[PDB]
Amino acid sequence: CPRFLKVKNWETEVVLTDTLHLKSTLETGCTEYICMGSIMHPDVATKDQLFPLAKEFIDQYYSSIKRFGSKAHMERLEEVNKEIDTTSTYQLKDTELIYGAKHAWRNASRCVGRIQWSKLQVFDARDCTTAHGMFNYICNHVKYATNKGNLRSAITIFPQRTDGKHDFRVWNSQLIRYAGYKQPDGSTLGDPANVQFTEICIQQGWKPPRGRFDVLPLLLQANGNDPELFQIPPELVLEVPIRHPKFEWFKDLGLKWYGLPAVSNMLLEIGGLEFSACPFSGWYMGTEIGVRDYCDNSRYNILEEVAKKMNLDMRKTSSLWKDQALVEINIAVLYSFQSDKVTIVDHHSATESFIKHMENEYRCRGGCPADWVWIVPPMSGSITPVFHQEMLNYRLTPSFEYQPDPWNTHVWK
Amino acid sequence: RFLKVKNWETEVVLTDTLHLKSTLETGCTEYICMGSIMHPATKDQLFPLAKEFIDQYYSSIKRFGSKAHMERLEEVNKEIDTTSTYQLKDTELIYGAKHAWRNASRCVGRIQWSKLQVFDARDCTTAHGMFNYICNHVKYATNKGNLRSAITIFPQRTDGKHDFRVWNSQLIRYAGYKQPDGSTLGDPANVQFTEICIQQGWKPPRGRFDVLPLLLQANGNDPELFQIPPELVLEVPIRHPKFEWFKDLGLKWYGLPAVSNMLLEIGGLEFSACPFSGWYMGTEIGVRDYCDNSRYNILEEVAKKMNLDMRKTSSLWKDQALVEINIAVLYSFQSDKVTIVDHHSATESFIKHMENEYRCRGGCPADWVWIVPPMSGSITPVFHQEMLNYRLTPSFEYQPDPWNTHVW
Ligand code: HEM
Ligand code: HEM
Ligand SMILES: N#Cc1cccc(CNCCc2ccnc(-n3ccnc3)n2)c1
Ligand SMILES: N#Cc1cccc(CNCCc2ccnc(-n3ccnc3)n2)c1
Ligand SMILES: C[C@H](O)[C@H](O)[C@H]1CNc2nc(N)[nH]c(=O)c2N1
Ligand SMILES: C[C@H](O)[C@H](O)[C@H]1CNc2nc(N)[nH]c(=O)c2N1
Ligand SMILES: [Zn+2]
């Protein structure tokens, strides 16, 4: 593998040099002869597998704090080693855990919000033992992160996996999402993406209101046990009704969204330890709601109804009626969040900050992995600077990983 | 191994077997993906390349291992042996050029791949010859507005000292001028080329849309200037179906998109001069040509005339202005009966083409980064389509700008 890889920005002519890729730990899916960069997805670890993984991370941690080679460093290496030998695992110090989560975010190729990576509140919930305990921690996370509209990024880390038969898991894919109900007639009420999960919740005992925007309950699994339902207190679920600065009729659509974007199905890997339940949250880029949640055909799919209210010619596609509605919807989303003083960032500002962040990373770290396919916003791509930016993709560790949906693996008791 | 690709909207799963056929690299490795990087002979090298191509040619016409296939292999071997190169049959040239289009990972218009007018210009010897051939191409392809896809193929490379080259990156483009006050008149992407034209004798009109002359190099010789006769150059005045003030922007574009700077590789032969042309997807003009900061950069002007609040980025004024520009471009071309496809229609056709390719060919190489339109990405179906990228031959490759190689 080559020592220096250059990427270029095609609108500013800036060239950056990447050395960090040499520290790549995992496979990307690509080979010499095929590229899988647009493919969405291209039992525990033995003692022997864990030893070098742990050392790798510990070395890296003591390297970050400018104590590489120190007594404290060597002592820590030895402590971790004995712990692995005697217990087949080890426990992270609170300092290491914090470093590891911040760096898993820093290494997330697909997150455009990474300029903020070092400002992350880490709630250590490794003492949790029950689903009620998980609910408590989760509620505290939500309230802290929401902060009455002034969102602050955060992660709550439940205990690491042990034997695989005692995982903690948040079954929800996000802490806050709306239900989706399939009708006997084929139509979907609510969010079609969440139909399967809503069916599971209803089966577990949830009494559904059956509306368009029903906040799903939390489904919480502690210590490998069956999961349990909890309704998040409504006063902790900040929501924004969507209106438009020009079109008075826009509020008549009755749209709203939740303020807090919180991913809860990913797995946090630090030094070979797997934290299978690690809900994290930041704040929204407008396009996530205005383009994807609202306009994807398999989601809320409102383009037709908005365009109809805009009295647009909808016969030919070459009128770009879809395109026109899309912009107005995204204008509305940004306008509504800013009006109710809930943090949100537009795709222009976010991508511009990411370019600045990426350049700084190259300067100070010798690189910054990024996934162009995810980093480029799903509307008006080329009018943002990331589009013109060459990016290298590669997986560093600590990292956030995907994991199977828990209903597919859970052994019911 | 067989690879699945999934559409996340429709949930359709195609199975790729075609990728197993490729030998050329893509630039990625197992640990690093370079999917967004713009750019990641001898007798001995030449025959296996020749044999490969001839084999897939006789296979595509169900005459594999036939007498004709055998004699042809013999013919090509003897010819490489005694001349260090070899010449393609007419049939092979056509098959080869259509398949270079078909294999073009980055081209969204490939549903049309087998409708390609191939112009064999291999008898060419001079730049005057080149200009004649190109004018015929332009006139045929333009077809009064009912565009027809074409490629013109000039003599293959020999020793590298005798390349045929179209110095222009496209047959039809607009000049670009560095103003004394630091700004750029016309197309900034062509400032250098324009200067090379001016240095060479071209008297520039110094306007915002001056069709550049052709600069043609034949047989490794100094390039020569030629003006395409204006009556062969179809141009569209851009206007808007609601905004009457839009024509007052004075914007115009040319109807014929013709890439002239690439290299067509067939059976290990290199055709350094092979201008090809299709028709426009609207975004190429409306999004990239008109709205890139490094290009015509009109967003500010347009949003001005739309009286938009331009103080904050979160007003999405850029996005608004963008949609209108692209509406205007489509409306204009359509009003002039000049062929053009919008990004919804085109991407739809591409999904259909992918499905076709998977059925009959076991796959379709594709560059998601290039296939997804540079506006309204996820409201087009290609955004939700997993694409596998790999390099098949025959192929269109990039090559150096000739003013970095040529000695005078
Ligand atoms: C602070 C404001 C943040 C912004 C503006 C932001 C922005 C984004 C966006 C737009 C996506 C694309 C999601 C999609 O299209 O499905 C994303 C993905 C992601 N972000 Fe963030 N993010 C933020 C905070 C965070 C934090 C705090 C973390 C972790 C500690 C994080 C880690 C990730 C990861 C791991 C993904 C990939 C998710 C997946 O693959 O499904 N982000 N981010
Ligand atoms: C028939 C109508 C066609 C349409 C609508 C179409 C569409 C497109 C578009 C939108 C691009 C992206 C250009 C860019 O963003 O720089 C592209 C690239 C390309 N097309 Fe086409 N195309 C057509 C015909 C053709 C033909 C006839 C050929 C060859 C015989 C061809 C070969 C290519 C190649 C090699 C590229 C890559 C260009 C590069 O790498 O710079 N296309 N096509
Ligand atoms: N696997 C998978 C998979 C495929 C498509 C979309 C997905 C969602 N990924 C995260 C989406 C999402 C939602 C809310 N918030 C955030 N978020 C919050 C902070 N950073 C991102 N991200 C997962
Ligand atoms: N090198 C290089 C390089 C990098 C990015 C874009 C580029 C231009 N690509 C072609 C643009 C263009 C122009 C006119 N016509 C067409 N066109 C027509 C049919 N297919 C493409 N394409 C070159
Ligand atoms: C097929 C393709 O990879 C898929 O649709 C991707 C494209 N890029 C994306 N980019 C972001 N940010 N989020 C997504 O969900 C996707 N989906
Ligand atoms: C850096 C990045 O690869 C570059 O900006 C690409 C992105 N995708 C593109 N897609 C198309 N169709 N045409 C282009 O010129 C580009 N440019
Ligand atoms: Zn790749």
Curated annotation (Swiss-Prot), chain B:
Protein's UniProt keywords contain RNA-binding: no
Record-listed (6R)-L-erythro-5,6,7,8-tetrahydrobiopterin binding positions: S36, V369, W370, F383
Descriptive protein name: Nitric oxide synthase 1
Gene name of the encoded protein: NOS1
Tissue specificity comment: Isoform 1 is ubiquitously expressed: detected in skeletal muscle and brain, also in testis, lung and kidney, and at low levels in heart, adrenal gland and retina. Not detected in the platelets. Isoform 3 is expressed only in testis. Isoform 4 is detected in testis, skeletal muscle, lung, and kidney, at low levels in the brain, but not in the heart and adrenal gland.
Known role: Produces nitric oxide (NO) which is a messenger molecule with diverse functions throughout the body. In the brain and peripheral nervous system, NO displays many properties of a neurotransmitter. Probably has nitrosylase activity and mediates cysteine S-nitrosylation of cytoplasmic target proteins such SRR.
Covered residues, full protein: 304 to 721 of 1434
GO biological process, alphabetically ordered: arginine catabolic process; calcium ion transport; cell redox homeostasis; cellular response to growth factor stimulus; establishment of localization in cell; multicellular organismal response to stress; myoblast fusion; negative regulation of blood pressure
Family to which the UniProt record says this protein belongs: Belongs to the NOS family.
Transmembrane segments: none
PTM comment text: Ubiquitinated; mediated by STUB1/CHIP in the presence of Hsp70 and Hsp40 (in vitro).
GO cellular component: calyx of Held; caveola; cell periphery; cytoplasm; cytoskeleton; cytosol; dendritic spine; membrane raft
Coarse class of the protein's main subcellular location: membrane
UniProt entry keywords in alphabetical sequence: Calmodulin-binding, Cell membrane, Cell projection, FAD, Flavoprotein, FMN, Heme, Iron, Membrane, Metal-binding, NADP, Oxidoreductase, Phosphoprotein, Synapse, Ubl conjugation
Protein location: Cell membrane, Sarcolemma; Cell projection, Dendritic spine
Residues annotated as binding L-arginine: Q170, W279, Y280, E284
Domain of life: Eukaryota
Domain notes: The PDZ domain participates in protein-protein interaction, and is responsible for targeting nNos to synaptic membranes. Mediates interaction with VAC14.
The protein's assembly and partners: Homodimer. Interacts with DLG4; the interaction possibly being prevented by the association between NOS1 and CAPON. Forms a ternary complex with CAPON and RASD1. Forms a ternary complex with CAPON and SYN1. Interacts with ZDHHC23. Interacts with NOSIP; which may impair its synaptic location. Interacts with HTR4. Interacts with SLC6A4. Interacts with VAC14. Interacts (via N-terminal domain) with DLG4 (via N-terminal tandem pair of PDZ domains). Interacts with SLC6A4.
GO molecular function, one term: calmodulin binding
Species of provenance: Homo sapiens (Human)
Residue sites binding heme b per the record: C107, Y398
